[PDB]
Design a protein around this ligand. Structure first.
Ligand SMILES: *[C@@H]1O[C@H](CO)[C@@H](O)[C@H](O)[C@H]1NC(C)=O
Ligand SMILES: *[C@@H]1O[C@H](CO)[C@@H](O)[C@H](O)[C@H]1NC(C)=O
Length: 310
């Protein structure tokens, strides 16, 4: 045939372990498993290289450990399974060929496991919208080929490890809606990511070293933190910045007039300690007043005109 018998028996184990959910109805010992839904075989090796279990509210239990028994997996997705619980099983460490691991929108908990650096082909690592706990493993920073890391919407505490600025190739990082504390590491000055989303944490201090004219940054969201620095020290911006959200921080100083050279699509500095005139140009008078409310003394279009004598 085509379907490898060992890949076949592992899939039949996983089906059994999940209590024959409906989404595995295609998994019949009649038909070649390469034919089945949710899975993909390689063209040459004919091994299972893909398993996508998604969007099934009734599916109850843990990640079956027999996922470790599909040794040629390149993509393993468990997404939008609210009744999936327990911890990420240690067995995923034997999946040396994964490029895409997405375990997200589930009730997976415990610590972020420590074996991910060993998964050297990883390009996408998405553990987002779970109940993961404790600190970020700094050694994740050693993966050589990551494009994106999603740890957003868990229950992670502690600081951003210094070495998280040193990912080879500067992948996008999403840490938002956790309980992270301390400063953004200055190692991020040397990183060139396209997107960063650290919003809804308890981060403090400065991020001025994230901006600057040779960076390829397009999207920055640090809204809902306690950032406390003088925005006047950012006098040049990454030219392709189109999304900048800093609402709900303790940022002070004033808006550089260099902001008017950006094609900003999204812009929000509401609920800060900013002062002085909103500069004229670019898209700045195109944002409605809600991008600028709850500041100390910003004035001008679209806020009311500057009134020094009142
Ligand atoms: C903030 O930084 C700039 C230059 O880096 C300085 O000129 C300015 O007065 C400082 N602002 C405040 C409010 O301390
Ligand atoms: C800015 O943020 C506030 C708070 O999240 C929100 O209510 C408001 O609509 C936002 N405005 C813009 C223009 O993004």
């Amino acid at each position: 045939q085509r379907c490898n018998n060992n890949d076949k028996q592992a899939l039949l184990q996983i089906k059994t372990a999940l209590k024959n959910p409906t989404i595995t109805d295609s998994w019949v010992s009649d038909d070649d498993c390469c034919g089945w839904d949710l899975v993909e075989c390689d063209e040459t090796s004919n091994r299972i290289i893909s398993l996508i279990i998604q969007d099934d509210e009734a599916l109850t239990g843990q990640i079956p450990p027999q996922v470790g028994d599909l040794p040629y997996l390149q993509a393993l997705w468990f997404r939008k399974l609210p009744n999936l619980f327990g911890k990420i099983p240690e067995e995923i460490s034997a999946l040396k060929d994964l490029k895409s691991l997405r375990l997200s929108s589930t009730s997976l908990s415990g610590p972020v496991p420590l074996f991910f650096p060993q998964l050297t082909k990883l390009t996408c690592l998405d553990l987002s919208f779970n109940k993961l706990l404790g600190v970020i493993p700094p050694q994740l920073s050693t993966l050589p080929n990551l494009k994106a890391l999603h740890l957003e919407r868990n229950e992670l505490t502690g600081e951003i490890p210094d070495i998280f600025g040193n990912f080879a190739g500067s992948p996008d990082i999403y840490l938002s809606h956790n309980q992270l504390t301390g400063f953004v590491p200055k190692t991020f000055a040397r990183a060139d990511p396209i997107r960063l989303d650290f919003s809804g944490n308890r981060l403090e201090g400065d991020i001025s070293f994230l901006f600057g004219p040779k960076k390829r940054l397009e999207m920055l969201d640090f809204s809902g933190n306690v950032l406390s620095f003088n925005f006047s020290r950012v006098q040049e911006f990454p030219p392709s910045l189109t999304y900048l959200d800093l609402n709900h921080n303790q940022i002070s100083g004033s808006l550089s007039s260099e902001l008017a050279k950006l094609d900003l699509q999204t812009f929000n500095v509401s609920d800060n300690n900013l002062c002085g005139k909103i500069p004229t140009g670019g898209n700045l008078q195109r944002f409605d007043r809600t991008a600028y409310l709850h500041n100390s003394c910003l004035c001008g279009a679209p806020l009311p005109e500057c009134a020094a004598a009142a």
